Automatic annotation (TrEMBL):
Annotated family: Belongs to the NADH:flavin oxidoreductase/NADH oxidase family.
Chain sites annotated for binding FMN: 36, 38, 78, 125, 247, 325, 345-346
A molecular function GO annotation: oxidoreductase activity
Source organism of the structure: Didymella rabiei
The entry's keywords: Flavoprotein, FMN, Nucleotide-binding, Oxidoreductase
Pfam families referenced in this protein's UniProt entry, alphabetically: Oxidored_FMN
Domain NADH:flavin oxidoreductase/NADH oxidase N-terminal: 17-360
Name of the protein this chain belongs to: FMN binding
Length: 443
């Protein structure tokens, strides 16, 4: 049997309560959110723009299986809005000039149909990468300003961005608006704006990347203006029942004059613009059991506490989720003293049915995988690899088993080899498991 994180309590009943969003009027049927995870399982062509971004049959199957997992609110991984503005090869893409019909549309529709078949909400996360698109994909990226993303530790470089012109901003807004309309037409419950992880919206929010002197730079209200203009323009086009959320990360507001006056203005912006929910990330609520050195995470985690405790208690109409580090029922229930719901990402790649199993009382903690939780690169590769398995309708590999760690690491090595020799850029996605001992999904 799998080793699992221990829990201080076995009462999960609070997590099963529906959550009513005040603006859309829709309810998530429980307090669980499946955090967005870039799947890299949409079509890719390094030499042809339009051939990219169509959700594959395997991607649809991944959301079919998550749709059976008892999850209140399922987020997609980030969806792009232009063919050459990609977080990664294999991203899904809703191009600004695409029709609400045809092969691409029916693929997006099928993903939503499978995700919501058993009553989950399915919310499409939409993002523009801004300065954080690789030069091999975009030679002329756009940002709030011209601050180049320098020296990435991974084998990926980024070109110096240009400051967005007024027309650039109009095209970005309309790409988000078109994506919202498209998701609505394709049957999605809503849209989540990706305001985190240094992508375009975070580039406007962060003073390190936003040096603008016009109405989009300076004060927190000005730095958030492009977000407000997006939601204003979305509301002119989609039904008021369409859910609208945003993911925010403490890192964007860190070491940069955050205070109660700022936290209050952020909450004012969220509620006056009718966000159904904000998903707060940047640290962990549940602490890991002294597994590894914490020098390199201390300043991020301390600010996340200040960030989340300055935002969540102020909001009332807008609902709050915290995503990051949740493993066990005891910690998830404790977090409901501060926020409305809990987001899980990596645990739901390793265990797509964990929420169902928690609510039925079969487990009280996620599988305790044999990978250090602070080894971000490796835990991310593991989660992407599990999504790829479920896409193939195979069961996730139990990484709590010492037996499975060896072959997994061997395949990670082989995959890094393939991506290093990817001169032609045709390869994409996460690790392909070599093991013949994979089993059909559901054992
Ligand atoms: C493989 C992988 C892909 C992810 N992709 C996205 C993404 O597309 N958009 C996003 O906002 N966060 C993404 N995340 C971050 C997660 O949503 C989540 O915030 C983070 O993993 C912390 O939650 P956890 O401790 O439950 O995994 C990704 C994380 C992983 C591991």
């Amino acid at each position: 049997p799998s080793a699992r994180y221990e829990s201080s309590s076995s009462d999960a009943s609070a997590l099963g309560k529906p959550l009513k969003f005040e603006f859309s009027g829709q309810s998530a049927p429980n307090r669980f959110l499946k955090g967005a995870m870039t799947e890299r399982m949409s079509s890719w062509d390094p030499e042809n723009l339009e051939a990219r971004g169509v959700p594959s049959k395997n991607l649809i199957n991944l959301y079919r299986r998550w749709g059976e997992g008892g999850i209140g609110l399922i987020l997609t991984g980030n969806i792009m809005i232009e063919y050459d503005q990609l977080e990664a090869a294999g991203n899904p893409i809703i191009p600004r000039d695409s029709d609400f019909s045809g092969e691409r549309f029916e693929a997006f529709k099928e993903l939503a149909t499978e995700a919501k078949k058993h009553g989950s909400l399915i919310v499409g996360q939409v993002s523009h990468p801004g300065r954080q698109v690789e030069s091999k994909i975009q030679k002329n990226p756009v940002s709030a300003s011209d601050v180049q993303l320098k020296g990435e530790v991974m084998g990926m470089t980024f070109a110096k961005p240009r400051a967005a012109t007024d027309e650039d901003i109009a095209n970005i807004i309309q790409g988000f608006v078109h994506a919202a309309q498209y998701l609505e037409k394709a049957g999605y419950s809503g849209i989540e704006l990706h305001g985190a992880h240094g992508y375009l919206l975070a580039q406007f929010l962060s003073p390190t990347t936003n040096k603008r002197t016009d109405k989009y730079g300076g004060s927190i209200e000005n730095r958030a203006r492009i977000i407000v203009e997006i939601t204003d323009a979305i509301r002119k086009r989609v039904s008021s029942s369409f859910v609208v959320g945003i993911k925010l990360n403490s890192v964007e507001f860190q070491d940069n004059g955050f205070n109660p006056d700022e936290a209050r203005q952020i909450c004012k912006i969220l509620e006056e613009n009718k966000f159904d929910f904000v998903e707060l990330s940047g640290g962990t609520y549940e602490k890991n059991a002294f597994v590894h050195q914490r020098e390199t995470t201390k300043k991020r985690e301390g600010f996340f506490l200040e960030f989340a405790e300055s935002i969540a208690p102020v909001l009332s109409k807008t609902k709050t989720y915290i995503t990051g580090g949740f493993k066990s029922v005891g910690a998830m229930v404790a977090a409901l003293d501060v926020v409305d719901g809990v987001g899980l990402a990596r645990p739901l790649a390793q265990e797509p049915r964990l929420c169902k199993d928690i609510l039925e009382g079969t487990v009280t903690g996620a599988i305790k995988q044999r990978i250090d939780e602070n080894n971000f690169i490796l835990t991310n590769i593991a989660a992407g690899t599990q999504m790829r398995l479920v896409g193939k309708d195979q069961e996730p590999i139990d990484l709590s088993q010492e037996e499975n760690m060896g072959p997994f690491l061997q395949d990670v090595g082989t995959w890094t080899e393939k991506m290093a020799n990817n001169t032609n850029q045709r390869e994409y996605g996460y690790v392909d498991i070599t093991s013949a001992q994979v089993v059909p999904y559901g054992t």
